[PDB]
Amino acid sequence: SGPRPVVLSGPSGAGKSTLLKRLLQEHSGIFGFSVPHTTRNPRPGEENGKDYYFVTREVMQRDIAAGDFIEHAEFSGNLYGTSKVAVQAVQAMNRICVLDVDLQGVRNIKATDLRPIYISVQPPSLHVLEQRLRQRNTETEESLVKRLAAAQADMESSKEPGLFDVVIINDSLDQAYAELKEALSEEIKKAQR
C-alpha cells in the first residue's frame, strides 16, 4: 500500500527536533505530515485538506468511536485531533508520515491498524541531558527542573519491552542520525523508487 509511517518520541531537547530537520533535508519529497480533523468553522486563509479536515461533530464522534483517531481534544465546543486515515492518505502518496507524540500517543497508534516504526530517541544520560539543556538558556531554573523530571519519566517509559521497536542513544548526532537512517531504510528506498 505504501511506506510505513514513523513514530518519534523522547525528550524535547534530546535531539529529535534536530534529527527530524536533518532528515527532512537530504531526503526531499520523502516525508510528509498528516492533516488533522476539526468540527470548527474554517478560519480566513484556511483550506480543506491542507490545514484541517472539516467535518461535523456527528461524523467525528462516530469515527472516534470507530477508533480512527490517535489524538483528540475539545477546546470550545468543537473537536480536534489527528485521524488514522489522514496518516494513511500521506502513506498513499509514497511519503513517510511523521508522528511525534507523547508516551500516550504511542499507545493509541498501537490500537489502530497502522503499522509504523516506533522510534524513541533518548539522551545517553540525564547528566548530559542536563548539560545540553544548561548550555543554552530557555528555562528559568524551575521549568528546567520540571523538564528533567518530565524527561526521566519518558526515559524509563521507553524501556517498556515491545513499545518502541528501535531506541536510539544520542551519543553523537552523526551516530544517532546513522542509526535513524538505517532504522528507516526500506521505507525510504520504497519511497525513493
Place this chain on the structure above:
Amino acid sequence: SGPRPVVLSGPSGAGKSTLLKRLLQEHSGIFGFSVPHTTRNPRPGEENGKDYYFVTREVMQRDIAAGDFIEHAEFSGNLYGTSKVAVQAVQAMNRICVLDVDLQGVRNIKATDLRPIYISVQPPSLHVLEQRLRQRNTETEESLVKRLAAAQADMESSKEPGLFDVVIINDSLDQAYAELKEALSEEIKKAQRT
C-alpha cells in the same frame, strides 16, 4: 455547517449545463464541487484532498456501510465514489456544493442527512426538446432518438410528489436562469454574507 447544498438534475440538452456554467461564471467563490474517494494508488500529478480522497479499501466499505457515499462503483479492483463528508467539507468552506447527478443520483442524496435543495431543469415538452436539439446538428439519428427516449424516462420521473423542491421549465434561457438564482437566493446571500 453553512450554505445549503444544491442538486441539479434533469434530461440532457434541456439547459441544465448551460444554466449551471452561467451561474458559476457570475458568482465566483460561492459554489464548489465535492472531492470523491478512491482506493486506487495515486497517479502522477494528483494531490490528496484536491483530485481524490485516497483511502484504503477497509474504510471505504466501512464508510459505505455507514450510509456515507451517495454513489459508489468498482473497476479494476478498486472502489470509487463521492461521500457526504466531502459534500459537507465543501459546505464548511462557505461554498454551495453542486451535485450534478441523474435521477438515481437524486434519490441517493435523499437518504443521507444532507439538507440540499433539489432542483430539476426540464424543457417545455418533449416536442420542444426535439426542436431545440435537432437545430444543433451535432447528433446522428440513432443517437438522437436514444437521447429523446432516455429523456422521457427522466421527464416523467420528475413528476413525483416531493422529489424536487423547485422545477424550472426552460422556456427562455434568461427566465430559467432567473428562476435558478431565485431558488438559491437565500443560500447565495448566506455565502456572500459570510
